Each structure stands twice: as structure tokens, then as C-alpha cells.
Write a structure and sequence with these properties.
This is part of a larger assembly, with 3 copies of chain A.
Chain A lengths: L11 H6 L1 E4 L2 E4 L28 H5 L22 E8 L7 E2 L3 H4 L14 E2 L9 E3 L18 E7 L6 E8 L26 E2 L7 E3 L5 H9 L4 E10 L2 E2 L5 E2 L9 H5 L2 E7 L4 E7 L15 H9 L2 E3 L2 E4 L2 E2 L6 E4 L1 H11 L17 E5 L3 E3 L27 E3 L2 E6 L9 E9 L7 E6 L5 E4 L6 E8 L8 E7 L3 E10 L7
Parallel strand pairs in A: 5-19, 14-20
Antiparallel strand pairs in A: 1-2, 3-7, 4-6, 6-11, 7-9, 7-10, 8-11, 12-13, 14-15, 16-17, 17-18, 19-20, 21-29, 22-29, 23-28, 24-27, 24-29, 25-26, 25-28
The complex binds calcium ion (9 copies).
Chain lengths: 501, 447, 447
């Protein structure tokens, strides 16, 4: 009521139940504050820095920090944290390249025809954050690199995916050259960014890429010829953060981010969202199970995602800038330990939904947004119209399903897809009669036909198909049916890139 | 009602309404203070630095900051922001071959930047050659707004430091093939001046790099290039969703007037005698601003760009036309007009050109520049809606299209390009079915 | 009253009116203090530093600053400003080739500059060979106003460091070998000023003159004096135009010059160091803006005197003391004395005019005339009846012959001519008059 234990200008009762800031003072939360646009903050009443970041709970809630720090970081539970990596555009030994942020996380994914009781996401043995990057050359026509030189400097640009700017960027990178490192070069004096705001780059887009200049044998040369692609990853990044001064000015000297990385990473649970092009990474505070004096509030996976990514709760489904990021509209990726945790906690849950599982310290999450996703209700970004679409029903996963009686076919041009990229075609199937059968057929570089048996209730199936060539045969999807089948939430998502000779 | 939530020497009741500075004391603004020479200031009552610059609201309003900061930036909403770049003037290539460049720093912002240390790039075609940061002998001690280093009347400084090391053949062959070199800056390091505890101005620990992100993030960008000069401004704007953000809301026209200290002639806006009003200038918006303005105009009946609320993230470019006539006192076209009609009483501003038939106008290219695009714009009105408006374009490419007249004046813009100094003249003929009303016909230079 | 708004130890009522410092205590000015040698100071009551320089108004009025700072700076409206620039005495080329230069630093400002370290450019035509900054052993520890480093009577210091500087290649020095020379221009200069700390010692370490250059240049108005051998540059503060809260006092050009150069006033005439600097005695050179504003302010004035125009910030003035001046009263330095001159009149500018005896013509050789640079013939003309015509013919590189109609009042004419060629012949100047014309103040000034 009036006690302030941790001394962060927030009373214990308000910080335990829920508080909000009005006129730069904390007031007790009431449900009538919702329509005005306010938000309900809750944090630990024993720690002044709940999230692990340099700024306290009051400094985050009241927004008395840099006006560059994202509003999703002013939540007392979401850390203000820079995730800075280095990407390679051109290399000097000769042509342009291309890179993907969430690439190493998707190489080690195996997708089965069916799923298990309740569990929906996939499992990956290699969960590398958005900082680790691998390239993918495009201008190559398949010829050897020896054409022109026959042998017997690079252009890069830093990027930030976190919720805080980082001043004085001094990253450290390895010239791995696909398994055999040569030198751990560092950005000495000409390659430091004065500042790098979130969702931005140095040098900023529209400017020429930065070049580091201040030795390649035929092994990695023939590896590049054979199909291997060059990789650039950053071991560490050295930067600074901004805080006020006694005179009222901002200082970023002596305030390093390297003093808070080990503290932040050991308290939070990492969540990654990839929307095809824009990649994000957030750390959300979590409670240690053993300690009885740990007062970090408990939130579910859905609440954690909504707080971290500032999604809009339009009814009951999460929306991110209009894109549905609900667990039934995306494909979640876990690691081994998070998979075990979710699987064991789903057995005690009647709802059997991932987004209703309590967030636990040490989790790793990766949300992969499908490239084309339709639900037959209001959202359809598919380039074409599915054959024999039925919508006169109320028995869909959200609003209405598709009365699959016969066959449904879609056409997908090769140009609208990307070459040498593995894809996953997934959706929901159900047959109340539990008597009909479903078989699917695709045509690609390899033609594969798969069959499945629907169950009484909604279950999610997933099938793997790949694409090759920039301009080649298109992709055709056929859903052959015998009786009446209900289909909903059908989508295709972009997984890692398959190599070629 | 003398509360001070932000603690910046201005009571919040004075910030919510108007206020002004008298004898270094903030007082409530009165309607009769305008004729004496004062101004009305409004600012957020929850931030002490409304615009994100290192100077508070009281310091900016009362003029208690560096005296080289333009009064253009003494309003609490206009951020004191030094916008600085580097431009080349000539190339010194000599022989391996070593690269030497003569450059001159430029400033377009509203604040002076002490100890300028730019970082540039050497680019010929995509492939970046080297990144050069001014080390010791090419650091500008002072750079006032709208000035250079070295000052006008002094030869440019030479940048030949790590010394430049291109390869012997590839770059030389590429340049000789018909290519040129680019020197684009990525960042810059400079200081700002604050009076310390005992009154001495110190610029040693005061960096502009701690405020760049904040100023960029709490404000919106507005640019004015007059053809001879260019100006860069940032004006604070309020967050949409946040209910605890108390930044005042202003329109686009008021934002321009604040950001450039223009004098308002009732409705006309003048910078230095050059008109600024929306009809007399061409506004170039990016995508997000285009959709924002269109959507918010769909909800308004005024149909005026300058009456649109200014919010965060919008980019506006105001390109002052070079060839512009209003049939009252403005005439700068290369050739004399034809079939003029100065007798009118219902014109856009004072009178309108009641053109009957067609207009034969030619454009001598000697008064024109090559390899640059142009547009021609004006206001067309035809209550009868029975005349056909068509234009023929003689240029590098031939194009002719029709126009649909409307009851009221509507702007029309068509793009064309002229290349080659050793070419022929450029002629565009205006043709109409009969008596038509046209006003503010103008031509503006583009990229 | 003891009201002190800016807290600089002078009450506001004393700053608005006159004041003076007695026993280190500011007292109200009385008209009888002029006999004792006291001076009437005025300043702005809303500013602790009225001129923008590091020393406050109480530190400047009372002389509580460095004793090397000239007494012209003690006026609170005259800024203490060091204007320094690297000279050149020798250019040694050492052949592959090497460049050696003997430079000597000059100071024409008002306050000394400590730890002088200028930045200079090596240019010959357009292009810049290199920019060099005095690194460690070419730094002036002390540079008092109107003094040099090395001091007079000492040899100039060598300047040969940067690896090392050489001519670029074999394809560029042919421009020098063809009859062209390299020049030295100072882009900027860095130094520190002196303040007295708590212990009473003087420290010049944390200080920096580069902190107050923009402020002083943007607040004050530049005035430059020339005396043929030495030149002086001063900055005098002035108030803004549309600002009601700018309390800087307004002064005309006359007392601005008197304050800036400490000229002694003998009733009406103004002598700097025995050389008259009145409006008629010398000639003034302006830029476009200052000339325009001076003329516009003057056309409201019946007195029609330049020294009566209110001084405004942004005004640049250059004063050139004539070299060949004669007023038919007490001085005539022309090598060839004027012919047909009578000294019996009563309508002169100050004492007596010249009774022209018809035709006057004089021949001046080039023994005392500097070649290759233009000169200006100036004087006063008037005709009570306007019954005569005055024509002038000058023998020079080009045949110069012009005519003028004298007015009824004292009008000052200015005719220019260029004496090109080092070994030019004897220049002939002729003036033709129809009858007897009363003239005064004939002047020839080098440009
Ligand atoms: Ca607390
Ligand atoms: Ca707390
Ligand atoms: Ca549905
Ligand atoms: Ca306030
Ligand atoms: Ca405020
Ligand atoms: Ca008109
Ligand atoms: Ca005072
Ligand atoms: Ca004062
Ligand atoms: Ca006389």
C-alpha cells in the first residue's frame, strides 16, 4: 500500500497486482484504464531491474529512457537489448551474394507426415540466434570460380534486431571459410558505427556497404565450386548504452553492454520471430523454479509473445501488423529442452494449446511465419484461387473449413517462389465420419505422392517439398478426397536452402 | 496552478496552453503580444527535452543556448540538429596510382558542429574501395549552419590519408571505360557547446552521437531546397498509441512555418520572398507519408495538404519550382507566353488565364540543363466540362496524352526527360477545344 | 535600484543607462567623469556576456582579465578576439623534390592567443597539394596582439614536415615551371585563452578559442581598418531585428569605430594615431548587403553621413586610409605638388576650399607608386551655379577619358584606374574644368 522494498519508486502492492504510470507517477491498475490506451505492468517487488537490462522498472514503465528504445522494451518484463550481427555482401579474393538471418536454425529440421497428441511445433538440435548468418550466392551460373583466374577485403553491413540502439559498434568476426578459420579480424577505427538503432543498419540502406581491409587456398575454392557457400558470423560485439547525467545530458562513455549480457541471458527466455524478411529477437524475463524468493511474474507463451512483439489482440488471435501469428497460423520451432518441457506440461493441460504454457527460464522459441497462408475466413494471400472452394459451413478451425469432396488444386508460379529453397506444406485435416482417406500429390524436381487418414477432430499434417531453378516448372498441389473432408489453416512456409552442385 | 511536473522552469499549465518568455521568465501568452514582436510557444509538460535535443524547453524558448544556433530552432518543437555532409570538387589521380581528393564540408542544419570528423566511402560501381575518416589535419574546428569548411573564398582541403591504395589496373581501366567515382559519407563525429558550472563554454565531452537516434526517432523530417540552397529540419511529433505522450499536435503548414521561420502573408507563406504555399511549390513525399496523407484527406473536406496533422515518421520534400508564373507579377519562363488573358475576377489567387483555343510556347534549351528530368504542373478548371485538354511533348521520347477537366482547379503533373547538351530545342504546345481556365503553370527540376 | 537580472554584478538600471567602474564597484555615470578620464559603458541587462567572448561584462569593464588584452576590448560591446594568420617569407623548393617554407605567424586581433597551432593549405591554382598542421615544434607559446611569432628581429621558423611532402608527380609541377607560384592559405587556427582560477593563477589548458568563434562571429559585426603598413580587425556587438528580448544597445558607425579602435575625438574630427579617420578623410569599401542596407537607412536621413547609420549585426566594413592625401590645409604628400592652387576661400569642408585657377594637371612618376595594382582617384565636387563642365582624362594601360556634371552640393566622386606592368611609363592624369570650381579633399589610395 505504501511500502517500497527494492526502492524503485513503485510500491510493493502495486508491483505485485498491477500498476500503470499516469503523469509520471505510478497508480493502481483498474480495468477502466484499458479503453484509454493504458497498459498493465507487473514486475518483481524484490528487484529494481527485473529484466536484467540497465534501466529499472520505473525507468522502463514511465518511458524515461532514450526515445529510440522500442515501446515493447518499456515493459518491465522485456529487456532493452541489442542483437547486432554482421552480414557479407561482396568478397574479394567477385559477384554479389545474399544472406538469411534464420538459416542455421532451419537446416536441422525434420518434418514428419503427422504429429502427436497436442504438440504442434517442430524440434531443432541447432538453435542459433539471429546473429549467426550464412550467405547464399545468386549471380553464379554453376560454373567454377576458377573461370578467369584459376588460382592454384569484403563488403559488409552491420544490422540490429533488438529493442535498443547500440552506440560505438565494434564487432569481432571470424573468416571461417567453411570449417577452417584463418583470422579473427576486428573493426579497428574506420569500421565502428557511431550509432545503430533497432531495425536499422550501418551504413544505412541506400548507402554503399562498409569495407574491411585492415590467402585463400584451393580447398575452400573447390568447396565453393562444389556447392558450399561462404559463411560470416560474429563471435562478439562491443558497444555502449545511453544514460542521463547529473547535468541532464546523455552520456554513452563507460556504459558498456558487455557488463549486462551475461546477466540478461541468464534470466530471460529467448523468442525469435521471422516474417520472411524482417527478423526480430526478444528476451523476456522468467522466474527461477528453485528459488522461493524469486518474484518474477509468471506469464504464458502467448502472453510473452504479445508483450515482446507488441502484437494486437484482435478478439482472441494474435496479430502482428495484420499478419496472424497465432500458433495455429505459424510453425513454431523449439530446441530439445523446450520441446521436453512443453510436451510434459501439455499432459496436465485440458486446452492442449502451446500458447497456454507457462514461460520458463531458458526456453528457446522460433516463430516461422508462412509465406502464403489462407484460412477461408478473412485472410488469403495465396497468389491463386484453390479449385472447388466451399465456405457454407460453421465447422472450421476459426470460422469455416473447406468441404473437401473430390479434389482441390492450386497453381503456384515458380517465379513467385525462390529457387533452391526447402518448403513445408502444412494444414489441418479432420473427418467426423472417420471413414474416408486423403492422398496428396505434388510435382517438382522429384514427384512425391503421400496419403493420410483423417481423425474425428482437427489434427495438423505436414509434408515436405523442395524447389529448384529460378525459371522452371511450377508447383501444383492436389488434395484428392473420397468422401467429405474438412480442411482449414492451409499454408506453406519457407525453410532452409537446399544446396546444388 | 503553478505545478511543474517536468521541472524545467515552465509551469505545465503554461505549456498546455500558450506561453512566452519575458525578462527570462515564462509568462502566459496573450493575444496582444503578437504585434510587439513575440511568439507563442507550446511544449510537452512531461518531458524537459521535448524535441530530443540536448537543450531543454526553457533554454530553447528563452534563448539561453549557443548564439550560433539559429532562431529558426529556438522553438521547443524544432530540434537543434546539425546536418553535415562532404562533397568533392575535383579529383587528383596520379601515378600503381595514388588517389587524392579535394573536399569541402557542408552544413544545412540549425546548430553549429564543433570538431567535425566525417567518415566517407570511395565507390566507383558498387565495389567500395576504402573507408576514410578525417584523422588530424582535416578536422573542422567550427562549422556554423549554412556555412562550409573551408569557408567560402578558400581552396578546398586535400584528403590523401589512409596513402590511398587502389590496384594498378582494374580501377584505372574501369574509370577509363566511362565511369566516375563517388564520395558518400556514412557518419560524422562532432561536438556541441554547453556552458559549464562557471560559465565557460565547453565542447569536449558533449557529443552529437548520443542524440542522433533520439532526434531521428521522436520527430519527422522536412526538407526545403530552393535550387541554390538546401535546408534540413526535424520537428517533434507525438506518438499515436501512447496516451502519456503530451507533445502538441500541429499541422503540416504550421510545422513548415515553425521549422523555417517563414512569414505568413495571411495565407501565403514566404521564406525570403520566395513563395512556400502549397500551390506555388511541389511537395515530394515517400510512400508511408503518401498513404497517410491520402487516408487522412479522405476524412476531411478541406482537401489541403497543409491542413493535415503532422505525426511521427513522415518525410516531406519541398522542391521550389524554377520556372513558375502566376499571371500577376511572376514570369521566369525562357520564352514569352502566347494567347494570354489577364482579365479575370475569379482566379485561383487574384486572376486566372482565360485561354481561348491553344497556346504556342517554346522552351529554348540554352536556358535549360541536360541529363536532368523535369515536370510541368499547373491548375486546370473548366465548369463547362466540354473542352478537351491535350499536350504534346517534344523530348528524347515523344508522348501525347489527354486530360480530363474538372469543375474546380486540380493539379496535373507529367514527367519528361531531356538528355544531351548538343541536341535540339524542346517544345511543348498547349491545346484546348475552347475557352479554358488555367492558373499557376510551372516547371520544376527533379532528379 | 539593485535589480540584477543576469547576475553579473551590475544593476539593470545602470546597464540600460550609462555606468562606470570606480574602486571595482559599478557606479552610475555622471557627465563630469569625462574630465578625469573615465568612460561611459553600456551593455545588455539580459546577458552576462554581451559580446559573446569568454569574459563577462564586469570582467571587461573593470579590467579584471589578462593584461595583454587591448584596452579596446574593455568596452563590453567590443569582443576580445584574436585574428591570426600564417604569413610567408620564403618558398624553398629542394629537388625527387622537397618543399621548405619560412612562415611567420601574425596577430591583428584584440586578445592574445596561447599555444597557436594553425592549419594551412598548400595551393597553387585550384588544386591543393596537401593540408599541413603545425605538429609539435611549430607552435607559438605566446602571440600578443599586433605581434608576430617569431618576434620582430628574429628569423622565421622553418616549415617542412608532413611521411613527407613532395610535389605530386612529374605531370603537375610544370605548371609552376611555366611561371606560376604556390600560395599558403590558413583554413583555421587553434589556440587557448587565459582565465584566473580560484587560487589566483592563470590557466590556459582547458580553455579554447574555437569555442567562442561561432558565437562572436554570429553576434557581432566585423570592422577592419587599414593604415598602409598595419591592419586591424575588430568585432562590435549588435542586436537582432525582430527580437524584442534582445537588449543590446544600438550605436551608429561613428561611435562604433571610436569604441573599436579607441580613436580620440577632438570635438568633431576623429584621429586614431594622428591619422584622421573621418568619413571624408578615408574611403570605405563594403559588400553588397552592407551597402544596400546603409543606403536604405541613409535615404531616410537628411544628414546623409555614413557615420550616422545605426550599426547592425552582419555588417562588414573595410576602412582604407588614403596614402596620397591633401586638403590644402596642413598636409600634402604628393611627390609632385599640385599646380594652379589658391588657398583663399571660406566655403571649405572644414577650414578652406581650393580656388581652381582654370586647368590643373600634374604628372606623378612610378617611383612612389606600386605597380601592377589599381589605384583610385577620389575627391569632392560641387557647383553653386552648375555653369561649368568637368571632364577627366587619364593616360594608363587603356585610354581613360570620362566626363561628369558636378552637383550643387558637396558630392564625393570615385574614379578607378589600373596601372598594369612593373616597368610602366610615367602615368599621366589630367582634370579639365570649364571655369573656377571649389574643390577639397583630393585623395589617391592604393588598392
Ligand atoms: Ca518496488
Ligand atoms: Ca521492482
Ligand atoms: Ca478457417
Ligand atoms: Ca514544465
Ligand atoms: Ca517541458
Ligand atoms: Ca493567376
Ligand atoms: Ca546586470
Ligand atoms: Ca550585462
Ligand atoms: Ca578644408
Amino acid at each position: 500500500e505504501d511500502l517500497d522494498t527494492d526502492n524503485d519508486n513503485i510500491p510493493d502492492a502495486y508491483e505485485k497486482n498491477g500498476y500503470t504510470i499516469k503523469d509520471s507517477i505510478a497508480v493502481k491498475w483498474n480495468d477502466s484504464f484499458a479503453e484509454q490506451g493504458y497498459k498493465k505492468y507487473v514486475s518483481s517487488y524484490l528487484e529494481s531491474n527485473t529484466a536484467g537490462d540497465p534501466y529499472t522498472d520505473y525507468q522502463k514503465a514511465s518511458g524515461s529512457i532514450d526515445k529510440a528504445i522500442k515501446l515493447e522494451a518499456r515493459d518491465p518484463l522485456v529487456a532493452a537489448y541489442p542483437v547486432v550481427g554482421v552480414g557479407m555482401e561482396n568478397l574479394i579474393i567477385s559477384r554479389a551474394t545474399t544472406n538469411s538471418k534464420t538459416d542455421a536454425n532451419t537446416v536441422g529440421v525434420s518434418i514428419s507426415a503427422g504429429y502427436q497428441n497436442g504438440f504442434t511445433g517442430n524440434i531443432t538440435t541447432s538453435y542459433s540466434h539471429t546473429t549467426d548468418n550464412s550467405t547464399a550466392v545468386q549471380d553464379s551460373n554453376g560454373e567454377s570460380w576458377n573461370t578467369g583466374l584459376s588460382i592454384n577485403n569484403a563488403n559488409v553491413r552491420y544490422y540490429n534486431t533488438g529493442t535498443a540502439p547500440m552506440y560505438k559498434v565494434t564487432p569481432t568476426t571470424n573468416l571461417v571459410l567453411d570449417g577452417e578459420t584463418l583470422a579473427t579480424i576486428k573493426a579497428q577505427d574506420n569500421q565502428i558505427g557511431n550509432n545503430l538503432s533497432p531495425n536499422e543498419t550501418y551504413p544505412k540502406k541506400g548507402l554503399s556497404p562498409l569495407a574491411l581491409n585492415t590467402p585463400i587456398n584451393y580447398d575452400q575454392l573447390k568447396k565453393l565450386d562444389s556447392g558450399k557457400q561462404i559463411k560470416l558470423e560474429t563471435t562478439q560485439v562491443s558497444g555502449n548504452y545511453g544514460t542521463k547525467n547529473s547535468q541532464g545530458q546523455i552520456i554513452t562513455e563507460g556504459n558498456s553492454w558487455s557488463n549486462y549480457i551475461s546477466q540478461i541471458d541468464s534470466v530471460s527466455a529467448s523468442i525469435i520471430l521471422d516474417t520472411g524478411s524482417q527478423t526480430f529477437e526478444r528476451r523476456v524475463a522468467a522466474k527461477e523454479q528453485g528459488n522461493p524468493e524469486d518474484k518474477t511474474p509468471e506469464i504464458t507463451i502467448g502472453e510473452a509473445i504479445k508483450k515482446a512483439f507488441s502484437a494486437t489482440k484482435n478478439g482472441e488471435l494474435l496479430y502482428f501488423n495484420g499478419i496472424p501469428i497465432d500458433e495455429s497460423c505459424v510453425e513454431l520451432i523449439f530446441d530439445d529442452n523446450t520441446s521436453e518441457i512443453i510436451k510434459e506440461q501439455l499432459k496436465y493441460l485440458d486446452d492442449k494449446k502451446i500458447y497456454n504454457v507457462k514461460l520458463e527460464r531458458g526456453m528457446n522459441i522460433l516463430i516461422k511465419v508462412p509465406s502464403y497462408f489462407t484460412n477461408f475466413d478473412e485472410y488469403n494471400n495465396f497468389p491463386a484461387s484453390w479449385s472447388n472452394i466451399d465456405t457454407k459451413n460453421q465447422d472450421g478451425l476459426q470460422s469455416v473449413a473447406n468441404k473437401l469432396s473430390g479434389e482441390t488444386k492450386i497453381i503456384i508460379p515458380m517465379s513467385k517462389l525462390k529457387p533452391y529453397k526447402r518448403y513445408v506444406f502444412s494444414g489441418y485435416s479432420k473427418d467426423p465420419s472417420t471413414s474416408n482417406s486423403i492422398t496428396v500429390n505434388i510435382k517438382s524436381k522429384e514427384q512425391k505422392t503421400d496419403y493420410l487418414v483423417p481423425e474425428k477432430d482437427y489434427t495438423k499434417f505436414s509434408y515436405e517439398f523442395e524447389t529448384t531453378g529460378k525459371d522452371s516448372s511450377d508447383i501444383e498441389i492436389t488434395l484428392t478426397s473420397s468422401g467429405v473432408i474438412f480442411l482449414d489453416n492451409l499454408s506453406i512456409t519457407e525453410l532452409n536452402s537446399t544446396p546444388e552442385i
